[PDB]
């Protein structure tokens, strides 16, 4: 079972490249990292920085996540990234993406590895 | 000094059984899992699923925690559980419980393991 | 690369001393613990308790952190600690601190180890 940390690396790390090589970059990446295996992940971002650099962000500026959790951290400096967003016509199994390169700060959610149960909140 | 993860297992996991086999299930389990040694724990639920299944809930749907932390996750599917609630006359050293078998989504709070001090927030 | 757990032990743990052994303790300590290498850290506290005693706080009373994060806990018992506040005259590389012994409850922020990225939340 791939861990969440491992899956983050497969889905969002692309350290061997400095920017998107072309407009088709997202079509080739979404596919090779298996993000189109059984559905078209709608939107996905790849970071062109070293793993050490993205990992250090868990020690940078704390910010609340879009969902409210308090384990999100924003990078102190900008990083090269590529957003991949499914086009209007894309329909599994014919997933199509638009590639958008940019250089912005990133926000990642962090957790211990492993992350296990320690309290029983309730049953619903 | 039992770890919090091991304590959750002792207090909440009963994998070897599919459901409560009797109404005295709670009196027997609260006693054998040492939940009546330090006082009568008022309420406690046991999950009849694999350690793998329960551990995977830490990666399922994030939901609000009754205590306000942002580390609660609800299981995508229902699981067989056994709620143990102290009877009206229960009182240490004669703890007694009502057994209620059910099928419900469970909500557990998750944490890294080990889970250590990383910042000094304040003194009070 | 020093871990976050390790950096805490180095900046806030002083287990070999039951309390500030002199009013020059902060001046010595702030230097020996490298909190004066690049600049003089404004304020810092040391906890005169074993490491286990402090690690045990991650299981104690959950209280909000100064920044709103929900991973802070307050010790049930008060502890022997030392506040080090930089004197207004202090100017790097001449770091002068005012030492102040105290017996207070400590509040620490806790995380898993390792603590790594698991979701890409946004780019700002």
UniProtKB/Swiss-Prot annotation, chains A, B, C:
One Gene Ontology molecular-function label: nucleic acid binding
Family: Belongs to the pancreatic ribonuclease family.
GO BP, sorted A to Z: defense response to Gram-positive bacterium
Tissue expression profile of the protein: Pancreas.
Residues that hold substrate according to the record: 7, 10, 41-45, 66, 85
Disulfide bridge positions per record: 26-84, 40-95, 58-110, 65-72
GO cellular component: extracellular region
Listed result of changing residue 12 to A: Loss of activity
Primary enzyme class: lyase
Subcellular location(s) per record: Secreted
Catalytic residues in the record: 12, 119
Residues bearing attached sugar chains per UniProt: 1, 7, 34, 37, 41
Swiss-Prot/TrEMBL keywords: Disulfide bond, Endonuclease, Glycation, Glycoprotein, Hydrolase, Lyase, Nuclease, Secreted, Signal
Organism of origin: Bos taurus (Bovine)
Function of the molecule: Endonuclease that catalyzes the cleavage of RNA on the 3' side of pyrimidine nucleotides. Acts on single-stranded and double-stranded RNA.
Subunit organization: Interacts with and forms tight 1:1 complexes with RNH1. Dimerization of two such complexes may occur. Interaction with RNH1 inhibits this protein. Monomer.
Protein name according to UniProt: Ribonuclease pancreatic
């Amino acid at each position: 079972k791939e861990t969440a940390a491992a899956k983050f690396e497969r889905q969002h790390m692309d350290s061997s490249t400095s920017a998107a090589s072309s407009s088709n970059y997202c079509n080739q990446m979404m596919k090779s990292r298996n993000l189109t295996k059984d559905r078209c992940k709608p939107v996905n971002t790849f970071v062109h920085e070293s793993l050490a650099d993205v990992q250090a962000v868990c020690s940078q500026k704390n910010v609340a996540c879009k969902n409210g959790q308090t384990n999100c951290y924003q990078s102190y400096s900008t990083m090269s990234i590529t957003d991949c967003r499914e086009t209007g016509s894309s329909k599994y199994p014919n997933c199509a993406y638009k590639t958008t390169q940019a250089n912005k700060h990133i926000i990642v959610a962090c957790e211990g590895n492993p992350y296990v149960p320690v309290h029983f909140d309730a049953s619903v």
